[PDB]
């Protein structure tokens, strides 16, 4: 959108416009490499967001997300995105901070200084930013046997949410 107030969904909107114009699938369709980095890294993004979102509150309890990372790495292994592994733990190749949300949020961090001013706002910004690409990435999971972002995210979130609670 382009208003002097926007509210409710401003970046969310420009993030969605970027998301739409990011055509995570069109590039996965024109770029067979892009698809490799956008099909495995999308669910590895949720994987990583899981390790980011779950570990975010978990690092506050002083827990251990590695075992949970091991679980999203399962989904990340079973989903077809491998790359890291250690003491009975594994992680998907592109287990960074999301290849689409990074610049998607980087754009909004560059674009929306107002909404990204608070250190705890751009981190949460990428949280619903990963939820939108699931509409763009979903279709890359249709041309094969890959899980959807929502089916995989829920199964992942389910381990973030499982580690999330933990008494408190």
What keyword list fits this structure?
cell invasion; mainly alpha; two-stranded antiparallel ribbon; monomer; 2 strands; SopE-like GEF fold; 68% helix
Q: What is the domain tally?
A: 1
Distance between the termini: 39 Å
By DSSP (H or I, 4+ residues per run), the number of helices equals: 8
- Derived from helix and strand composition plus strand pairing, the structural class reads mainly alpha
Quote the beta fraction: under 5%
The CATH architecture can be given as: Orthogonal Bundle
Q: Which H/E pattern describes the elements?
A: HHHHEEHHHH
Radius of gyration over C-alpha positions, nearest whole angstrom: 16 Å
Structure summary, number of beta strands: 2
Helix content: 55-70%
Neighbour order of strands in the largest sheet: 1-2
Let me know the largest β-sheet: 2 strands, antiparallel
Brief summary of the model shown:
The protein has 168 residues and is mainly alpha-helical. The chain is built from 8 helices and 2 strands. The chain has a single domain, classed as Orthogonal Bundle (SopE-like GEF fold), CATH 1.10.4120.
């Amino acid at each position: 959108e382009g208003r002097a107030v926007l509210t409710s969904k401003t970046v969310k909107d420009f993030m969605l416009q970027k998301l739409n114009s990011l055509d995570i699938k069109g590039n996965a369709s024109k770029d067979p490499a892009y698809a490799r980095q956008t099909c495995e890294a999308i669910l590895s993004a949720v994987y990583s967001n899981n390790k980011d979102q779950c570990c975010k509150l978990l690092i506050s309890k002083g827990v251990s997300i590695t075992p949970f990372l091991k679980e999203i790495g399962e989904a990340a292994q079973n989903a077809g995105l491998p790359g890291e592994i250690k003491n009975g733990v594994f992680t998907p190749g592109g287990a960074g901070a999301n290849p689409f949300v990074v610049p998607l949020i980087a754009s909004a961090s560059i674009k929306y200084p107002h909404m990204f001013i608070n250190h705890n706002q751009q981190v949460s910004f990428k949280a619903y930013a990963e939820k939108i690409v699931m509409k763009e990435v979903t279709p890359l999971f249709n041309k094969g046997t890959m899980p959807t972002p929502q089916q995989f995210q829920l199964t992942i979130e389910n381990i973030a949410n499982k580690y999330l609670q933990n008494a408190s």
